[model samples]
Target: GSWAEFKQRLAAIKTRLAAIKTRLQALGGSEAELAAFEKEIAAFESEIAAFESELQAYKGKGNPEVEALRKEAAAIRDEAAAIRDELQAYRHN
Candidate 1:
């Protein structure tokens, strides 16, 4: 269960991730843009990994910290997987 404030905070993270993707798309698919996108994706992955570890800890201890955060994490994970697929496709292009 998440309070309104916590839900809003997690939603903001998702909003930022969407904004980053928009910026990447607006870069017009240049080589430099692709490189920068990869870098940014790496940073996002790092941040997500940290959140995942925290989630695991909470799950292990059976602490129902925040459902909104969990939902945000799942969204981020799905988005990251899509980015990874795009990166791979770009490489093969």
Candidate 2:
């Protein structure tokens, strides 16, 4: 459970998601729908960034406590990832 892991996973997942989203666009999927999914990814990305920064400041106090932030960040990253998976499935059609 690490915030750094969250950022890494999200960035990697976002790369895959954007590729699939672009493929969907080529297949004539609705721009609005695909765009909305990207917006969702950004929302999750935003939280991960916030959590990382918050944790950084927390650790500045000379302590390492981050179970809660790690948990929450992981949840957000996975949620965004699942949406990308669903879109990938959609693109297969």
Candidate 3:
């Protein structure tokens, strides 16, 4: 996948997760609960960012070997998107 697309998906997913975490905490939870969510969300976010870094490292190598891996990354990015959308719908209630 293109680096831009990967970054865009990661940004969108993280933004949503951050919003949810903030609002949920404000709505009241134990410190431990909030911290757990923080850890989980950050881990999810960092994984995507790691892929982004990998793609950037591969850039300008003039190599076609990464194409299939790129597609797999795009699918991963798409899954993040789907989760974000589901979250939006969930929180609207």
Candidate 4:
């Protein structure tokens, strides 16, 4: 139920979807080919929806505790980014 695990699963799903999209792009003009691509796209969309719903479970309910943790995680990420930027600037100087 961890957000980190959810993110990993989400990333894997995106990778698979991208591969399918690439295949669809190279599909021929044949009606059968198009139909197959459409079917695959629909299935991929459903998989994406399912993964998103599962990820929401990791988010928990929107209680104050969860909200506070989310805020803290965001702040930490921002601070980390700022520090990285500062380091790059200093290095370039």
Candidate 5:
């Protein structure tokens, strides 16, 4: 249950990250704008790596660890969304 959801969310993050990477490559803007985009992407990448490492503790077991992992996953999801939203705002501008 929790593991499945975590896998799905991680997949979604990867997909979004790929699209963002392509967008960053295609961007032709001021140095400052490009730098901001790169910075956000870097942050997202770092977070994803940490998330994956922490997720290893889940192991699909039905236990307190699983519950804790689920809560952590939600937090990760929100942080990831905020990063995506900030990047989108830059692209829109």
Candidate 6:
């Protein structure tokens, strides 16, 4: 119900995803761990995407709150996408 709380989740997601990517780079078989990461990522994405309509509501109101949330969401999404790509390539090749 709160954009503030939602932003915290974005922060945590970025932090943890960055952490996991670094851990994988240590020549560890984050290969095994990668599956779990994707699982969470997919579920998290669904949760975020499901809120799209409500996000639109906020956006139409010309409130700064929506922009902030959208910015964080987009940033974290880029990070997550990059991590998934890098992690998968690293694991398989």
For each candidate, give its TM-score against the true structure. Answer: 0.66, 0.45, 0.44, 0.54, 0.50, 0.59
User: Candidate 1, TM-score vs. the true structure?
Assistant: 0.66
Worst 10 residues of 5 by lDDT: 58-67
Instruction: Name the 10 consecutive residues with the lowest summed lDDT in model 6.
Output: 44-53
Cα displacement (Å) at residue 42, model 4? 0.9
lDDT of 3 by residue, 1-93 (tens): 665665576566557655655665463433334444445544665676576567656764664655555566556555555654545454443
Q: How many residue pairs clash in each candidate?
A: 0, 0, 1, 0, 0, 0
Pairwise TM-score winner, candidates 4 and 5: 4
lDDT of each: 0.67, 0.60, 0.56, 0.49, 0.62, 0.64
For each candidate, C-alpha RMSD in Å? Answer: 3.2, 9.6, 9.8, 14.6, 8.7, 3.5
Worst 10 residues of 1 by lDDT: 1-10
Question: Which of the numbered candidates is closest to the native, going by highest TM-score?
Answer: 1
Model 4 regions lying over 4 Å from their true place: 61-93
Q: Mind giving the per-residue lDDT tens digits that candidate 1 earns over 34-82?
A: 7666777767767766765666565567656654476677678678768
Cα deviation at 9, candidate 2, in Å, is 21
The sequence of per-residue lDDT tens digits that candidate 6 reaches over residues 1-93 is 467766676577667667756765554644676766666666655655554445667777776567667666666666667666765776677
The deviation in Å at residue 19 for candidate 3 is 21
C-alpha lDDT of candidate 6 relative to the true structure: 0.64
**Relative to the unseen true structure, what is the C-alpha lDDT of residue 78 in candidate 5, on a scale of 0 to 100?**
64
Q: Give candidate 6 regions above 4 Å deviation.
A: 2-27, 51-53, 61-65
Question: Which candidate, 5 or 6, has the higher TM-score?
Answer: 6
